[PDB]
Write an enzyme that holds these catalytic residues in place. Sequence first.
Site, PDB file in Angstrom:
ATOM      1  N   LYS A   1       1.038  -1.430   0.117  1.00 34.78           N
ATOM      2  CA  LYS A   1       0.045   0.077   0.196  1.00 34.78           C
ATOM      3  C   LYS A   1       0.886   0.791  -0.318  1.00 34.78           C
ATOM      4  CE  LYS A   1      -3.186   1.919   3.292  1.00 34.78           C
ATOM      5  NZ  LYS A   1      -3.390   3.641   2.542  1.00 34.78           N
TER       6      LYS A   1
ATOM      7  N   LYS B 129      11.028   5.320  27.167  1.00 35.28           N
ATOM      8  CA  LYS B 129      10.237   4.052  28.046  1.00 35.28           C
ATOM      9  C   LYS B 129      11.427   4.462  29.022  1.00 35.28           C
ATOM     10  CE  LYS B 129       7.684   0.939  30.022  1.00 35.28           C
ATOM     11  NZ  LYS B 129       8.181   1.534  32.146  1.00 35.28           N
TER      12      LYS B 129
END
EC number: 1.4.1.3
Lengths: 126, 496, 491
Positions: B24, B123
């Site tokens: 795509k 994180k």
Amino acid sequence: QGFGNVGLHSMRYLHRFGAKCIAVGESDGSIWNPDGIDPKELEDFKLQHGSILGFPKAKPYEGSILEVDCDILIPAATEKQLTKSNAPRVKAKIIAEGANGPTTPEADKIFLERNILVIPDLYLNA
Amino acid sequence: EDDPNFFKMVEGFFDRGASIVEDKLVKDLRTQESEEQKRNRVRGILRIIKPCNHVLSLSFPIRRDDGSWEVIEGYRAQHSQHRTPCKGGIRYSTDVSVDEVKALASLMTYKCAVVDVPFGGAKAGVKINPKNYTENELEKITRRFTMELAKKGFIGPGVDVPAPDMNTGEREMSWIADTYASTIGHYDINAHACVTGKPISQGGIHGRISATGRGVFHGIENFINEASYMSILGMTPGFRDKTFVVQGFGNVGLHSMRYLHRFGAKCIAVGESDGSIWNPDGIDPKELEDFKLQHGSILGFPKAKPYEGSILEVDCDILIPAATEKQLTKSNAPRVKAKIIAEGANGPTTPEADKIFLERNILVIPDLYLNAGGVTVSYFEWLKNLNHVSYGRLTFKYERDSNYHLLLSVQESLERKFGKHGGTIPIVPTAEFQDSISGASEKDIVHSALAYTMERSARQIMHTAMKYNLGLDLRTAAYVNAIEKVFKVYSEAGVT
Amino acid sequence: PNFFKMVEGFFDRGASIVEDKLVKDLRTQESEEQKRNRVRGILRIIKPCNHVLSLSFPIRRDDGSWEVIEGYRAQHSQHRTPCKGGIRYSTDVSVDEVKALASLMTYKCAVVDVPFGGAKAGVKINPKNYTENELEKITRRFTMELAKKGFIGPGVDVPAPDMNTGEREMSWIADTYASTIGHYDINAHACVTGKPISQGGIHGRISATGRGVFHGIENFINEASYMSILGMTPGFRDKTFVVQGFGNVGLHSMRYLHRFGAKCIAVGESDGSIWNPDGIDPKELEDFKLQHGSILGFPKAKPYEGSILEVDCDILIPAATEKQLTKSNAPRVKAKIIAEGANGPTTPEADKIFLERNILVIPDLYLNAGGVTVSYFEWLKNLNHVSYGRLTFKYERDSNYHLLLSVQESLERKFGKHGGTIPIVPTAEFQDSISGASEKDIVHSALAYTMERSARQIMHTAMKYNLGLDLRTAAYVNAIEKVFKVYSEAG
Ligand SMILES: [Cl-]
Ligand SMILES: [Cl-]
Ligand SMILES: [Cl-]
Ligand SMILES: [Cl-]
Ligand SMILES: [Cl-]
Ligand code: NA
Ligand code: NA
Ligand code: NA
Ligand code: NA
Ligand code: NA
Ligand code: NA
Ligand code: NA
């Protein structure tokens, strides 16, 4: 903790009054059974092979014997077994010092903060 | 046995979604080049998104209360910076590692892309146990950790926005915000926007506590009401006459149970690391919350019999894991009974369990969409600190007076048509409307925008799941949507 | 008769009342004795001004002469940045007073939930002996010395107009900062409020303080729980009020109280007082003073000799200087509600005299906070770089017409065509609002929301601590509690 002379008679008189021994640990291993361990069966087993490892009516405990979820913890082995490292992880509410000084003074500070009864050696171990 | 490391699972999830969505991207690319350079650029950008761009390992000292000196290990991984600032949590545990914070930072990127939150993945983690240190020692740990991150560009309102996580709460975020605002970011007008999850007095947003739990409720709400999906599960659409079981009665499980029971669902079993309660005719969330708050656990609930079996294998319709990683495993997957598994925690299912759940027609709502309610609200808290205003502070009474004017207008208009000779036609707001009007607060605006986010993101995952015909494999559909969005920002930005 | 710094006593007595509550809510991992120490400690930091800057900057007068001007700026608390306060041009300015007024601004902002710290400047000049060109150079140089030492900035300190200052001075302040220290600051024009509309000001600012006073009386005059103790019927119906001092706060407080049924019986000034029991009109008295220099000689009211604050009425609005109602003239007060339109016009001796007399007194840190609340909105306007409603007005206009038409076409579908049509149209008050939708309509709505919500917070702790009609202590109790929670939850 420590199935020596004191630890043998400690669990026998507690089991006599209704207490259930869920785990016994020495220097070479630790057994565990939440449904109780017979003191006489473990005493005869300790005499035969010189170790509590491989008890039939119990299971091996791969962990700290002092951090077992319980009510009473009885250190009856070596010195300074409850220090500032493992003391915040102790699940017991009563600590009966069956040996001479098995709790560091720093562990005494957080034991008093955690509301954990520590019966001292200069009285209990007499 | 089965369990892999979470670092391996996220890379596998990315590699699966990247191979599907690649075709795509090579066609929607409108660059002035041939189709081979186009596919090279698509595959080239995918090689950039996958690895963490920046990882910071820290080793800072501290002076304890007893006087001794300790050295604290810390980590902070910034997965991608395609949208600044980065967003992520700070974990306090001895189980943290570079591979751990790198994986959850990668998940944070794709989780933010699912809910259209314009943040990069981050994180943090330090190798301490908060039970070993006192409150004063945890403060000096947190403040010094903030100082080292600011000097190295790993915290800031436009650089990286930390958040609470395991063994960290609003208390730590308050220390983080006060440290940055008093030192490195003192001349920054938005210095308090450097962290989310703060208390209200420190700049926090309303509705943050129930944010993750409401996101779990709204997420399954979009799929339990979709007749196209619910026909495959073999259940009637709607929450009525449906039974759910929650694993872990912490913060997410508490509010997930509260919001599901409010809308017709019935809680059957609640399990934790302490035990498991069970009752086939419903468990009250309020009574369970007060029992958990009082005795510190859930064992011994008067209106629930104990359950010595597995909490994940309880026969029900919906299962909500809200605890630790990898709770559903290849060995226990063929023994679950619920048709919908609401992942109220990050990575609670192994990929091999996902394979069994797929071949058994078991709908698993992935973590990067369902466990994103708090992340979405954290985006609103970040915007609140930038606006230096609470939501509705300028418009609550203005919209209230206009609402009463609209009802009064209909009333006086209907009175001149039907009440010309005595009587009144009172047009009053509904009982549901007056509650919104009277108790109007920022929490109403925040939770409304949260529901709008979970609703719009659900239609995005559904549209992809039917385009590539993935069936009930919404995890792959979610990563495909996230990879396509991050690639869109990279491809339309140019080179270096 | 006179008094100096009553604010220190207001804090001392408010801190002792809130102390027991503040320890209960402390969830720190500490011992209840050590907790009581942190409650006592934080209050020891809030009470004194954290930072005080004394300046002496030079100017060049129009005649080529040189002068040295003394100026001060005291920042009380910085628990919430930036700081907010005014700039006073007067010969009687002192550091001891700009400190006290800065402390009042801290607790006033907390009462109306304004996230600013208390501050206040003061330049020791008489603006009458100076020209506009000289007053400009004084203002601009004063801004740069405050900027170099961090006493003005969008996130540091946001000044505001005060005595003998206004839009003219604030525009000079904003223009100077945005051309020097804050040139690279995108929000440089947010460094000061009270600016003209063309300079980034906000709509509804001139009528801000006056409207804030009306909503202060409104939230209490229509509460039977407090009108029964005073012995009056709820509402402004058939009520007379006297406004002491016809300044900016008095003119707008009169115009809005008159609109809702109130009647102005008298209005005194520093040179005379007019009186008329039938009622004076605010507009007729406004154009007269605009055409002249004082309200003396008003045709529709006979001249009134005597204390303008002791006129027989029901609500007294002192909007002039400080310490007008003292213990000397306290028992001779004829009004029943003392709406403080200025900063501390009532001594504590008169506060206890009015309390034992069952006379309500709306505190200054609440009723005189309308302009501060709107100044907070002006600060947010400069940060948004857009007026309120610019993106919303037409979207909100078509929605109301869509809703009314939706009710029209739905009911006509249900009732049929034979009975006729069912026209659904806005009210007279509604169409008046949608047609003239302006930013001022949003600012005044948000101000009324602030005064209404803050009144409930004062009424709550007034009956929680059983403070009766002494709202000032309840106002200081709430303000101290809010500032403490930010300190305690920050470490
Ligand atoms: Cl405990
Ligand atoms: Cl793969
Ligand atoms: Cl209903
Ligand atoms: Cl205007
Ligand atoms: Cl009409
Ligand atoms: Na027995
Ligand atoms: Na020690
Ligand atoms: Na500190
Ligand atoms: Na700041
Ligand atoms: Na804020
Ligand atoms: Na219709
Ligand atoms: Na108008």
